[PDB]
């Protein structure tokens, strides 16, 4: 019985600021992810932010 | 209530991985597991003030010096864990840590806690350090080092026995609230 994978750890950094953590599930539409991010960080105007990879 | 950034640093071979595992899961594994870096942001309130500890993992490897020293400027507080009675550790501290934090930011609160003191219960390390002709650091010199690094009050907490950690964080918060002029 493999452990459930519905919970993951991911830190979303900021330029010049220190990270904050949230649980993100990629199966749900990106609209739900944006709504949950804004709800967690208490940020308005959910249409003015998006997600990008800070790797190479 | 004012949320602030935070960085945690330390010496080599001191036990950061077990600290992070305990912080995230409330355990204490003696197994050594490699870890590159981490950040924990937890919401704990002390003295009626809601402050989030933006934890950060730092690695002593030579390769990632650019990454590690990038965020050292404009950092507001440090949590440092070190072997209490290692003369090389104090030598490296004097050569590297204290002069830089003193010259860069004259007003950066610093929280310091020593480690590697419960090993008296393990005779193996005592015999290891006896054969090399090493003497324990005198308490007077330790207190002088504690008082000479521009620290209001130095305190220590246990990770294996989990003693004083909450008290250490509370006293660090109190010191930051009313620091030196």
Curated annotation (Swiss-Prot), chain A:
Gene name, please? ELMO1
Protein name according to UniProt: Engulfment and cell motility protein 1
Q: According to its UniProt entry, what is the function of this protein?
A: Involved in cytoskeletal rearrangements required for phagocytosis of apoptotic cells and cell motility. Acts in association with DOCK1 and CRK. Was initially proposed to be required in complex with DOCK1 to activate Rac Rho small GTPases. May enhance the guanine nucleotide exchange factor (GEF) activity of DOCK1.
Q: Which residues carry this modification: Phosphotyrosine?
A: 18
The taxonomic lineage of its organism, from the top, reads: Eukaryota, Metazoa, Chordata, Craniata, Vertebrata
State the post-translational modifications.
Phosphorylated by HCK.
Where in the cell is the protein located?
A: Cytoplasm; Cell membrane
Q: How does it assemble?
A: Interacts with ADGRB1. Interacts directly with the SH3-domain of DOCK1 via its SH3-binding site. Part of a complex with DOCK1 and RAC1. Part of a complex with DOCK1 and CRK isoform CRK-II. Interacts with PLEKHG6. Interacts with HCK (via SH3 domain). Interacts with ADGRB3. Interacts with DOCK5.
**Which organs or tissues contain this protein?**
Widely expressed, with a higher expression in the spleen and placenta.
Q: Which residues of the full protein are shown?
A: 1 to 56 of 727
From Swiss-Prot, chain B:
Tell me, what does this protein do in biology?
Plays a role in immunological synaptic F-actin density and architecture organization. Regulates actin reorganization in lymphocytes, possibly through the modulation of Rac1 activity. Required for the formation of membrane ruffles during macropinocytosis. Plays a role in cell migration and is required for the formation of cup-like structures during trans-endothelial migration of leukocytes. Binds phospholipids in an activation-dependent manner; thereby acting as an anchor for other proteins to the plasma membrane (PM).
The membrane topology term of the UniProt record is: Lipid-anchor
How is the polypeptide modified once translated? (Microbial infection) Glucosylated at Thr-35 by C.difficile toxin TcdB. (Microbial infection) Glycosylated (O-GlcNAcylated) at Thr-35 by C.novyi toxin TcdA. O-GlcNAcylation completely prevents the recognition of the downstream effector, blocking the GTPases in their inactive form, leading to actin cytoskeleton disruption.
- Residues modified to ADP-ribosylasparagine: 39
Q: Which InterPro entries match?
A: P-loop_NTPase (IPR027417), RhoG (IPR042734), Small_GTP-bd (IPR005225), Small_GTPase (IPR001806), Small_GTPase_Rho (IPR003578)
Q: Which Gene Ontology terms cover its molecular function?
A: GTP binding; GTPase activity; protein kinase binding
User: What name does this protein carry?
Assistant: Rho-related GTP-binding protein RhoG
Entries under Pfam families matching the protein: Ras
Keywords of the record, alphabetical order, are: ADP-ribosylation, Cell membrane, Disease variant, Glycoprotein, GTP-binding, Lipoprotein, Membrane, Methylation, Nucleotide-binding, Phosphoprotein, Prenylation
Q: Record keywords: Transmembrane included?
A: no
Q: Which SUPFAM superfamilies match?
A: P-loop containing nucleoside triphosphate hydrolases
Residues glycosylated per entry = 35
Organism superkingdom: Eukaryota
What are the recorded Gene Ontology BP terms?
Answer: actin cytoskeleton organization; actin filament organization; activation of GTPase activity; cell chemotaxis; cortical cytoskeleton organization; establishment or maintenance of cell polarity; positive regulation of cell population proliferation; positive regulation of DNA-templated transcription
PROSITE patterns named among the record's database cross-references? RHO (PS51420)
Q: Which SMART domains match?
A: RAB, RAN, RAS, RHO
Binding locations of GTP: 10-17, 28-35, 57-61, 115-118
Family membership, please give it: Belongs to the small GTPase superfamily. Rho family.
| Phosphothreonine: residues bearing it | 138, 180
**Tell me, how does this one assemble?**
Interacts with ARHGEF26. Interacts with ARHGEF16. Interacts with UNC13D; the interaction increases RhoG affinity to the membrane lipids, targets UNC13D to membrane lipids and facilitates cytotoxic granule (CG) docking to the plasma membrane.
> What is one term from the GO cellular component aspect held by the record?
extracellular exosome
Q: Which disease is it linked to?
A: Defects in RHOG may be the cause of a severe hemophagocytic lymphohistiocytosis (HLH). The affected patient shows characteristic HLH features, such as hemophagocytosis, hepatosplenomegaly, fever, cytopenias, low hemoglobin, hypertriglyceridemia, and elevated ferritin and soluble interleukin-2 receptor.
- Tell me where the sequence motif Effector region sits in this chain: 32-40
Q: Does the keyword Nucleotidyltransferase apply?
A: no
Q: Which gene encodes it?
A: RHOG
Entry's localization field? Cell membrane
């Amino acid at each position: 019985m493999p452990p459930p994978a519905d919970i993951v750890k991911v830190a979303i950094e900021w330029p010049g600021a220190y990270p904050k953590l949230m649980e993100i599930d990629q199966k749900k539409p990106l609209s739900a992810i944006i709504k949950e991010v804004c709800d967690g960080w208490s940020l308005a105007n959910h249409e003015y932010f998006a997600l990008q990879h800070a790797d190479s | 209530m004012q949320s602030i950034k935070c960085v945690v640093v330390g010496d080599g071979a001191v036990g950061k991985t077990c600290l992070l595992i305990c912080y995230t899961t409330n355990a204490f594994p003696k197994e050594y597991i490699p870890t590159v870096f981490d950040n924990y942001s937890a919401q704990s309130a002390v003295d009626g003030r809601t402050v989030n500890l933006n934890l950060w993992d730092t690695a002593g490897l030579e390769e990632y010096d650019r990454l590690r020293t990038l965020s050292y400027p404009q950092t507001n507080v440090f949590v440092i864990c070190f072997s209490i009675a290692s003369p090389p550790s104090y030598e490296n501290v004097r050569h590297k840590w204290h002069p830089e934090v003193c010259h860069h930011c004259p007003d950066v609160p610093i929280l310091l806690v020593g480690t590697k003191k419960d090993l008296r219960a393990q005779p193996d390390t005592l015999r290891r350090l006896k054969e090399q002709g090493q003497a324990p650091i005198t308490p007077q010199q330790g207190q002088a080092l504690a008082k000479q690094i521009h620290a209001v009050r130095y305190l220590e907490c246990s990770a294996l026995q989990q003693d004083g950690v909450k008290e250490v964080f509370a006293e660090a918060v109190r010191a930051v609230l009313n620091p030196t002029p």
